Amino acid sequence: GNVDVELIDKSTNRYSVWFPTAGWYLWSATGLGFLVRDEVTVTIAFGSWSQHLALDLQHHEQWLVGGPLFDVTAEPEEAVAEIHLPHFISLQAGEVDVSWFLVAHFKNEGMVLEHPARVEPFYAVLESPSRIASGTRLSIPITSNTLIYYHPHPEDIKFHLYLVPSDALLTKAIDDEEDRFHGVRLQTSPPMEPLNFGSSYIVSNSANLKVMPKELKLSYRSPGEIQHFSKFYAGQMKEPIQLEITEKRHGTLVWDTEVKPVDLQLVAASAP
Amino acid sequence: LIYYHPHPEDIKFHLYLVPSDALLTKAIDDEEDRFHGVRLQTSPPMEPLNFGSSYIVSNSANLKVMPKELKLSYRSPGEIQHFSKFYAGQMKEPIQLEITEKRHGTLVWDTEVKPVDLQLVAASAPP
Amino acid sequence: DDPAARFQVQKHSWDGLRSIIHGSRKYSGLIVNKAPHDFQFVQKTDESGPHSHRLYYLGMPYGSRENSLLYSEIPKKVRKEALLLLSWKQMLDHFQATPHHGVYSREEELLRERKRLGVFGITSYDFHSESGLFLFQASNSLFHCRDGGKNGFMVSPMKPLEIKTQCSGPRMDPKICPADPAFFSFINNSDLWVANIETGEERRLTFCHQGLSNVLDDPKSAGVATFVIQEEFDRFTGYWWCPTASWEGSEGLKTLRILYEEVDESEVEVIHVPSPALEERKTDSYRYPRTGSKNPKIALKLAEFQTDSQGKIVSTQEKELVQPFSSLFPKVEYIARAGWTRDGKYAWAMFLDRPQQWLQLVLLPPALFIPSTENEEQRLASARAVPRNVQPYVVYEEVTNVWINVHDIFYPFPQSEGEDELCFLRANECKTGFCHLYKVTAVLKSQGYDWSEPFSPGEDEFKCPIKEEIALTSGEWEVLARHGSKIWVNEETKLVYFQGTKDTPLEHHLYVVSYEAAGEIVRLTTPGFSHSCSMSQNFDMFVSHYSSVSTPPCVHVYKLSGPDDDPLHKQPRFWASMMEAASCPPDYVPPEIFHFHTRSDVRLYGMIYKPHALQPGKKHPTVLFVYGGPQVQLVNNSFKGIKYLRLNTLASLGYAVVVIDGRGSCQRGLRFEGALKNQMGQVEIEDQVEGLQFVAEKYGFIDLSRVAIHGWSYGGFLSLMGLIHKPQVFKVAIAGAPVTVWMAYDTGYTERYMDVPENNQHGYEAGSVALHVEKLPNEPNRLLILHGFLDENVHFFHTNFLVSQLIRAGKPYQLQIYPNERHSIRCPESGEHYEVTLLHFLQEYL
Amino acid sequence: DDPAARFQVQKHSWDGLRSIIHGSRKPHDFQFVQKTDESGPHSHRLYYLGLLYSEIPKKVRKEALLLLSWKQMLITSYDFHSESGLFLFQASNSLFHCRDGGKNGFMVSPMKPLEIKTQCSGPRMDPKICPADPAFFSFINNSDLWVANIETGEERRLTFCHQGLSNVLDDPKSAGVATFVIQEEFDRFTGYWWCPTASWEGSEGLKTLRILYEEVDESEVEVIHVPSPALEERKTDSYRYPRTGSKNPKIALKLAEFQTDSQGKIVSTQEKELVQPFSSLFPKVEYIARAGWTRDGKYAWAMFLDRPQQWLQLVLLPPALFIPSTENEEQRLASARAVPRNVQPYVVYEEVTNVWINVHDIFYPFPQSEGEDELCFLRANECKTGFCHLYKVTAVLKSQGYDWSEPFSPGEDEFKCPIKEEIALTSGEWEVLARHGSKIWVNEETKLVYFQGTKDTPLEHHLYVVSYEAAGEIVRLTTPGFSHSCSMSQNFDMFVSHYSSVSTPPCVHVYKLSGPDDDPLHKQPRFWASMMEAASCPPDYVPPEIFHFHTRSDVRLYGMIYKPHALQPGKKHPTVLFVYGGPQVQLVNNSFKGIKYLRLNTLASLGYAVVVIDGRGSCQRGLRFEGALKNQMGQVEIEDQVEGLQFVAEKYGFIDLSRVAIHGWSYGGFLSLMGLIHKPQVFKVAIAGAPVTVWMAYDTGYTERYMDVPENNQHGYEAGSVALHVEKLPNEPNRLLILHGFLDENVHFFHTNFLVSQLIRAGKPYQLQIYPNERHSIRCPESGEHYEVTLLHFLQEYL
């Protein structure tokens, strides 16, 4: 079932988690499947990709990053047998190879890149770790960075201010701590988060998506783009104005380099 | 000449007679933003929300800020650099002087023919 | 000739062309990286720590814009199936190692033009192993730090200690004393100084320079390599520490020698070249030796000093050879190289003749240098005092009919087994035609010289007889010795690691051989790439910074591993990686290397860049890029995207780009290079034309009506030879920095290849393009001359005399100046202008 | 736009253009001397350069064009002494002399000139014969004043400030020469001036002979290296070039005297110096524009000038004001007591202005024999009314009485004389020619002063006469409709005039003033004989049409145009606006340009409209006209040129406004670059030859006169410094051709270099052409042929 957390330091976001015995033990609040064999006192933190790379591989466009970074330390020697580590990049047969996936490890050595054995549609596996900053995901595409094809999920906020709803459209890839602390950064314009998901189709990186509701209001910043950044940042949001207490809103995310769309969402103002 | 993830933010305050902004084009990291967001508050603005730059910017290159209309415009060449915590960043602190509604700003490079940021802000919800 | 079947390049606007060149360099912030170099492996010796070595090197991780000292941690055991890539930890505490706006002093800036240093920051550093001392040059000053000697191996970076001085001026060329690491030495205002780390005390050793006025009135320098040496003998040092310390046994005093080169450039022609500060409107004088004109008058000298146990330079002493240098070594014009044997017994020096057809290696034992004082009776006194047996030993004497190539490979062995019969590893290209290693044993038997009386040595005076001269390598390929290549000699396993072109001339590979018994040459590097390698001091692992034409350059660390009883076949296993292959961009189509044969049936290599989005049928216009001169091989299997990205930009606009390494290119043997001897400029262009004609026959997109020839330095000279003797072949000619009169170029280069000008005058005139302007085309707009105004190497006079003779013959030209650029266009803005000018000129007028 | 109502120039090959330029190219310094034989045929002999002579007859025949043959007597500048008849000139490596009709007779067959040997190592610069003693002459050798004697052959050094040790960077004091900035901005080519009369000390028999010279200490002046003509040796020459804002050479006036026995030997010698330092006696004095002596020899005059060049003053320096110069300070005090307390320098005249001083070499002193104070002279003064006008000035030489041993600081009006009168001999909206080696001729018997001026029109230089006693009326002597350069006899009975018009080539006619002697103003000039005639005007050459127009500010500017040959009305031809535009040069005047401006006719013969405009800021139209460029150099003139183009567009129907080239050398290139910056929509291309791209690099004398100082006028230095405005140059190519002579000492290669530097840094295209063997103007015919064919090609292809 659900497992508890102990917050040691909020600045570095460090969690102490108790593990009773053997089991699968998926924890979906970050996406860690800690396939364990005994009682494990595990420590997990949040890592930023900016400070751990060689500073050349963010801008190397044969070197796509996947997943978020974790500082996972646990008991070694088959106490934690398998790591099912959360990444985001999609799994179809064309233009994605299993061999292109890599799992890093950030020691005082530097980076240790090992291949994973199997690749799950949401997770990637690390086998028998021997350990800090271990939750890692890299990729070497033999072709360019712009064709590796996994889609963000939209995340929308309608907030009531001077009796006028300001909207907030966010199009970032699915990283749970990134999404959550993006909302915590968004707490300064205090948000309410309904449950609507734009996981219908796929889109690559370097993608210019235009946004439109089908009915037209004060439209701001239509040709947005698809990019990924650190844990603490500001992504390319959209901030239109509703100006009224109307109920119905239909947003649409559609490409520019080709005619096809990627997302059509229906949202009401029943809970502003 | 390594490219950086930009932080554009124009931090606003409704003062008693002349409201004041503060335009920042400053590259991201955690400690630099955490320095700036509390240490600008001694001459108090309040932190807004605006559009982070979609395209990627390079260092040692002067940028140009154009508002669509006139404002208090000194020190218009903007430069990007990475200091420590203690030193004051290369800032803009314009004053929009009144209670007018909307404001449009654009970032244009020196040697490019293309912009990098097209930001808009409204004073309809002033701090 | 169908005019609808000839590809017309899209006429871009100038601002469009700027947009294109900038878009060519928008990924150059990553790929142009200054990949790490100058490695120093250091052991840790714990048997309980994790790391086997610490690798020290220069590098730019692009956390800073400057080249700085860094280190890596080499582990004791890596995981299998793992590409481990090392973090580049910083040696220093993130300071600024460059002056404001990238400027330098006059001595610092002139050094980087000789070394072709386009990178800012710590470009050269010195290291002393067991003390762990790092002596380097930063913004305008000397700095130091230490890592794991008597101190430990730190994990955070520390700030480097400043070395303060009372001296006014830059402190050029620092070297740590190997025998005593507390002491070091540098050049200050063309005089040799010596200092100490802990106490801070300095001491001048030579007093030939005084800082009066310009170089026309204070002509004596010491411990420096002059222009032509730095320029033509890739030597940028003129002093060499003695690696061991002698003990005079007076009371406790520890002697420390330095060999230095005194140079009298009084009789050398002075030329004025404009200064970079154009506003101030002065020139700088340069002692630039023309061909025909006199070279500097050289001499070797020994500078000793002594030290207490506390480390203070109590005494000092200049010493000079017991006979004059010019008289002891007649017909010797140039000191190519010099140094010391490891034990300190002899100071070696490579001498050279003015035609440079006559090389000879000499050993100068420190007792051969008597003191120097003005009184001729004290001079006679110590001339009597020098032992009769002590002499200079000419160990090796290379004589050739074309020219000597300077190979820095000497390597002496210890002599403690029967203390004569010197054994060394000497490279000799003149013998078989190809640079090959040899083990040579010469016989140092004293003939007995009355050193007080002055005598004239004969033609074979100090020449030692050779016991044996085993050839460690043989074939139609060369061992890399020039251009900062070197050999690494493990004397424990009796192996010598060298670089060579055995597999193909297009690929530099690391080979190893046994020097005691050389039968089998074992390659250590992977084929399909060209490699710049560097071995460890304990010879258990090396680095290779390698690339091929397709892949961008990577830097991998290999580890020799295997049975110890057979070290020759020790298997290099990839241990860890430093730098990876950069992004090959989608607008960058990597070129294809080819070869072909001449009518004289000699194999020439060439490159071609394909026109992007090639359509079969269309005859594209062709830019024959060319250097063509010696010491440069354009065509090789290594990444061209770094330095020759512009050629791909032309290709991406639709130009066929052809590159031909005709006769006279390096790394193909002496007989191949020697086809330009006495007719420089006349055979290279013929090879380039034939290379064009081959590419025209092989590939179906070469428009012979639209051919551009283009090149810098020597190539622009060839571009002008192309437009002079091949006007129907070449439509236009973009000549960058051309050498238009060989009578004006300096001795070291020009005399080596053509002759002394009164000996050969017919070929100077024939291959001086400025004397053949009458043959340049009368119709306009075919010739674009590019030149950097501040060029001390190929002076603006060359372009000026060309433009002069074009005016006098009534011939048109276009011309472009780079007022702030010396020889290679270093400012990115200025390079962007250069390329947009090249694209515009071809777009409109080819 | 009409697609076929615009003339297209025939695109010629380069060799075609050479064929056109080659097919295009397929006397002065007059000295009258009388004979007075009373039986021969010729009254005088006219001596001139062409050295030659003519025979002027006593009476020519009517209705016969008399043309004198150019006979050989035996050289660009010579010196002459009338009575003994000495002709001293400089040959290739040596000095020469000859004589005509003194104690000897008038030669008819040619005689070889006697050679003067020397002990000097180096050339003998600046030869001048002593007026008091024709046996003696003087010259400069290795930047020091020497003196010699013809008959004995013996020479003698007079100054000892330059030792010739090395180049000029370590041995900077010179004597008897004019430095660079004086030579090129104050038009002085000598730095020593003989006293015209000899004083007698009366010890035994010694004949004293003074010389005024200018000492210069240019140690604190910037040294610049400029490439030597001999390019192979690859060395430069140092030049003490005073940069604008920086310090000028440190000047002083000094007397080098010597004495002579009757047999003619320099027995003694003596350097002499002022009782105070020069810098202290004359504070804020920067430049000696001109200097000399009064005709009797009593006082030595000098025109001083300040750093803004807005304060000129004439000063008289009596020889007793100069004590001998020695290092020992007690002998110095000794002769400070020895100088008379009464005698002191008299600042006779002082021009002060808000615009700038133009240096006028018109002073002329009168005899002071009536009441030996109160010097009366004829001084040109432009600052009063705005136009250069002659004046008679009578000052008051009253001694204040100075203790010259004790030092002091003079006040701003300390040595200034009070003036008796300042009659203006001319007045109007025109000026008297004073600069550029023009001069006045003063008949002191008939009380008349003959000058040149522009009273009819600025386009025509005419000889005028007025009385200096009664300024009644100005009488013209030259034929109208032409412009004349004239030269009088010393006996004032006949003159030469070298004259021309816009249509006719140069002619040289000799006129003779003739009439009743009682009324000297109204002598009628009658044509006596002609020396050189108007040559064959070629049918390839159509002379330009002069026009004038008014600005929107209602200022009249003049201009020329060369029409395209074989004009078809309707067709709009491309137009080359040739320009200089800057001061001291008036391009448009009624005079033949075919010698220097043949290229403009070649352009016309290809079909280009050639326009030439004298905007406001040009010379020979007064100070207010010239002064529109004060502190705004580059900002007003191009506007005047644009307005002139646009006016000519309405008048003449053959200017295509889309196809406009601006082209000029020196300033004509600085403006071409200003044209391309501030009027890019007007000017399509710009052929800028030798342009001044940065005024902060130019010399003091020019730049400071107009833009006064960079620390003061920084806004205007940046605004009119064209090299700092390269961002406004066109991004598109083929619009800008920069030409520059590599050896240029005047507008240095730094200017073109800094322009090319800033073009590269701003990412802007340019074409460029070098002249490796040419200093400022294109002198070599091969280089001029290349220059013109490059100009024709550039216009053919890119205009």
Coordinates of C-alpha atoms in Angstrom, one line a residue, chain C residues 355-503:
Chain C
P355 CA 71.0 25.4 -46.7
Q356 CA 69.6 23.0 -44.0
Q357 CA 70.9 20.1 -45.9
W358 CA 73.3 19.3 -43.0
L359 CA 72.2 18.4 -39.5
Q360 CA 74.4 17.3 -36.7
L361 CA 73.7 16.3 -33.2
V362 CA 76.4 17.4 -30.6
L363 CA 77.0 16.7 -26.9
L364 CA 78.4 19.5 -24.8
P365 CA 79.6 18.4 -21.4
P366 CA 79.4 21.2 -18.7
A367 CA 83.2 21.1 -18.2
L368 CA 83.6 22.2 -21.8
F369 CA 82.2 25.6 -20.7
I370 CA 84.9 27.7 -19.0
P371 CA 83.8 30.9 -17.1
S372 CA 83.4 34.1 -19.0
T373 CA 85.2 37.2 -17.9
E374 CA 86.7 40.1 -20.0
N375 CA 90.3 39.5 -19.0
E376 CA 92.0 37.3 -21.6
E377 CA 94.5 36.0 -19.0
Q378 CA 91.8 34.6 -16.7
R379 CA 90.2 33.2 -19.9
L380 CA 93.5 31.4 -20.7
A381 CA 93.8 30.3 -17.1
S382 CA 90.5 28.4 -17.2
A383 CA 91.3 27.3 -20.8
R384 CA 94.3 25.6 -19.2
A385 CA 92.0 24.4 -16.3
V386 CA 89.6 22.5 -18.6
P387 CA 90.5 18.8 -19.0
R388 CA 92.0 17.8 -22.3
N389 CA 89.8 14.7 -22.6
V390 CA 86.6 16.8 -22.5
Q391 CA 85.4 17.7 -26.0
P392 CA 82.2 18.1 -28.0
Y393 CA 81.0 14.7 -29.4
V394 CA 79.2 14.9 -32.7
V395 CA 77.2 11.8 -32.3
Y396 CA 75.1 11.8 -35.4
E397 CA 75.4 13.7 -38.7
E398 CA 72.5 13.7 -41.2
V399 CA 73.4 14.9 -44.7
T400 CA 70.9 15.1 -47.5
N401 CA 70.4 16.4 -51.0
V402 CA 67.1 18.1 -50.5
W403 CA 66.6 19.5 -46.9
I404 CA 66.7 18.5 -43.3
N405 CA 63.4 18.2 -41.5
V406 CA 63.8 19.0 -37.8
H407 CA 62.7 16.0 -35.7
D408 CA 63.0 16.7 -32.0
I409 CA 63.3 12.9 -31.2
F410 CA 66.6 12.3 -29.4
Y411 CA 66.1 10.3 -26.2
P412 CA 69.4 9.4 -24.5
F413 CA 69.8 6.3 -22.4
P414 CA 71.7 6.0 -19.1
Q415 CA 75.4 5.5 -19.7
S416 CA 76.3 3.8 -16.4
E417 CA 77.1 0.5 -18.1
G418 CA 80.6 1.1 -19.4
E419 CA 80.6 4.9 -19.3
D420 CA 81.2 5.6 -23.0
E421 CA 79.3 4.4 -26.1
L422 CA 76.3 6.7 -26.0
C423 CA 73.0 5.1 -27.0
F424 CA 70.0 7.1 -28.2
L425 CA 66.8 6.9 -30.2
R426 CA 67.2 9.2 -33.2
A427 CA 64.6 9.8 -36.0
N428 CA 66.2 10.0 -39.4
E429 CA 64.1 10.8 -42.5
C430 CA 67.0 11.7 -44.8
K431 CA 68.5 8.2 -44.8
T432 CA 65.6 6.1 -46.3
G433 CA 63.3 9.0 -47.3
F434 CA 60.9 8.5 -44.5
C435 CA 61.1 9.5 -40.8
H436 CA 62.0 6.3 -39.0
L437 CA 63.2 5.6 -35.5
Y438 CA 66.7 4.2 -35.0
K439 CA 68.8 3.1 -32.0
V440 CA 72.2 4.6 -32.6
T441 CA 75.3 3.9 -30.5
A442 CA 78.2 6.3 -31.1
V443 CA 81.7 6.0 -29.8
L444 CA 82.8 8.8 -27.5
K445 CA 86.6 8.5 -27.6
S446 CA 88.5 11.6 -26.6
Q447 CA 91.0 12.7 -29.2
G448 CA 92.7 15.3 -26.9
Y449 CA 92.4 19.0 -27.6
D450 CA 94.7 21.9 -26.4
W451 CA 91.7 24.1 -25.6
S452 CA 93.8 27.2 -24.8
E453 CA 95.2 27.5 -28.3
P454 CA 92.6 28.4 -30.9
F455 CA 92.3 25.8 -33.7
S456 CA 90.1 25.3 -36.7
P457 CA 88.1 22.1 -36.7
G458 CA 88.0 20.1 -39.9
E459 CA 85.1 18.7 -41.9
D460 CA 85.0 15.5 -39.7
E461 CA 86.6 16.9 -36.6
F462 CA 84.4 15.9 -33.6
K463 CA 82.5 13.3 -35.6
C464 CA 82.2 10.1 -33.6
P465 CA 82.1 6.6 -35.3
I466 CA 79.0 4.6 -34.9
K467 CA 79.0 1.2 -33.3
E468 CA 75.6 0.3 -34.8
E469 CA 72.5 1.9 -36.1
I470 CA 69.6 -0.5 -35.9
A471 CA 66.4 0.7 -37.5
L472 CA 63.4 0.2 -35.3
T473 CA 60.9 1.0 -38.0
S474 CA 61.0 0.7 -41.8
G475 CA 58.7 1.1 -44.7
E476 CA 57.0 3.7 -46.9
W477 CA 55.5 5.5 -43.9
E478 CA 56.8 8.0 -41.3
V479 CA 57.1 8.3 -37.6
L480 CA 55.6 11.5 -36.3
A481 CA 58.2 13.7 -34.7
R482 CA 57.4 17.2 -35.8
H483 CA 54.4 19.4 -34.8
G484 CA 54.7 18.5 -31.1
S485 CA 54.7 14.7 -31.7
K486 CA 57.0 12.8 -29.4
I487 CA 58.0 9.3 -28.3
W488 CA 57.6 7.7 -24.9
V489 CA 60.3 5.3 -23.9
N490 CA 59.6 2.8 -21.2
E491 CA 63.1 1.6 -20.2
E492 CA 61.8 -1.0 -17.8
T493 CA 60.0 -3.0 -20.5
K494 CA 62.5 -1.8 -23.2
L495 CA 59.7 -0.4 -25.3
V496 CA 59.3 2.8 -27.3
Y497 CA 55.8 4.2 -28.1
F498 CA 55.7 6.4 -31.1
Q499 CA 53.1 7.8 -33.6
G500 CA 53.1 6.9 -37.2
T501 CA 51.3 6.5 -40.5
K502 CA 51.8 2.7 -41.0
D503 CA 48.2 1.9 -41.7

